[PDB]
Amino acid sequence: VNSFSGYLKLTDNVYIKNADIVEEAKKVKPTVVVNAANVYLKHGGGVAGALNKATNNAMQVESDDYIATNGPLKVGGSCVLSGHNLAKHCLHVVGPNVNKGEDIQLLKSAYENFNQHEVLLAPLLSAGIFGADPIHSLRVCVDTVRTNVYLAVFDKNLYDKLVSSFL
Ligand SMILES: OC[C@@H]1[C@@H]2CC[C@@H](C2)N1c1ncnc2[nH]ccc12
């Protein structure tokens, strides 16, 4: 039993809700919140910019130190950093940017990072400025993640469409 509320069950282990991941994080304070990051951990907009703003830029300060030490992430890769005031930890995951020419097959690799954590609050990956159709992303999530994932879907029309879709 956990403190997530109002989620619609999609499979044994995947749950979905029309919600802003930032507000879900502030309310639930989960163990792991997933950020939809780029390889430079430059949190400008979308999920990343909104999460970072909610941390008063502390996420960006921590991220810049991480990059200065370790260099950029791989597309499809991840790192665990602090969750600041939003969660115990933040799992920064890089989905492929199809508008950068990056291989959509790397979306499966990106979701594989979720399997290292028993429970996560997460957005759909690659479905923002990275291009990728959200229907495909939800499908990859369901077919890749085996741990318990609570998906926060920002756009209501998109959520309704995802819920009403079989294939
Ligand atoms: O696929 C991620 C989606 C789409 C790309 C950016 C938006 C729409 N995003 C969000 N999802 C969940 N909580 C969010 N809070 C702020 C943005 C946001």
Side-chain angles (χ1 to χ4, degrees):
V1 182
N2 56 50
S3 69
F4 293 102
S5 222
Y7 281 75
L8 179 61
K9 184 170 182 61
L10 298 185
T11 67
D12 180 27
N13 66 296
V14 179
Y15 292 84
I16 197 167
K17 186 179 179 187
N18 170 225
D20 186 334
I21 198 178
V22 181
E23 295 304 321
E24 284 297 306
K26 282 196 278 192
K27 178 68 177 183
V28 176
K29 311 215 200 316
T31 304
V32 180
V33 65
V34 174
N35 182 31
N38 56 55
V39 300
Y40 308 111
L41 303 179
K42 286 313 188 198
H43 311 303
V47 170
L51 286 170
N52 175 59
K53 178 178 174 186
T55 75
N56 184 44
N57 210 50
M59 177 180 287
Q60 191 64 67
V61 172
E62 177 194 33
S63 293
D64 287 351
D65 171 84
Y66 172 92
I67 296 287
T69 298
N70 301 107
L73 296 180
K74 298 170 178 179
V75 183
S78 70
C79 68
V80 180
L81 291 172
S82 179
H84 300 277
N85 52 316
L86 303 176
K88 187 170 195 293
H89 305 285
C90 178
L91 180 70
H92 296 271
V93 180
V94 183
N97 184 341
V98 170
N99 302 330
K100 281 176 190 142
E102 298 176 350
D103 176 17
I104 196 57
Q105 307 303 317
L106 289 169
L107 185 56
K108 188 172 183 75
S109 304
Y111 278 117
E112 288 172 341
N113 295 288
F114 290 25
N115 289 322
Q116 301 294 317
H117 303 276
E118 288 204 324
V119 185
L120 316 86
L121 171 63
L124 285 175
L125 296 175
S126 293
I129 67 171
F130 283 5
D133 189 349
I135 313 182
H136 175 66
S137 185
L138 178 58
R139 184 77 255 164
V140 178
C141 181
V142 163
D143 293 342
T144 304
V145 181
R146 298 177 299 283
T147 54
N148 292 324
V149 56
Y150 289 82
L151 294 169
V153 173
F154 185 85
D155 187 70
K156 170 55 96 81
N157 192 44
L158 174 59
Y159 168 84
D160 294 340
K161 173 203 271 192
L162 296 171
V163 168
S164 66
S165 306
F166 194 80
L167 166 119

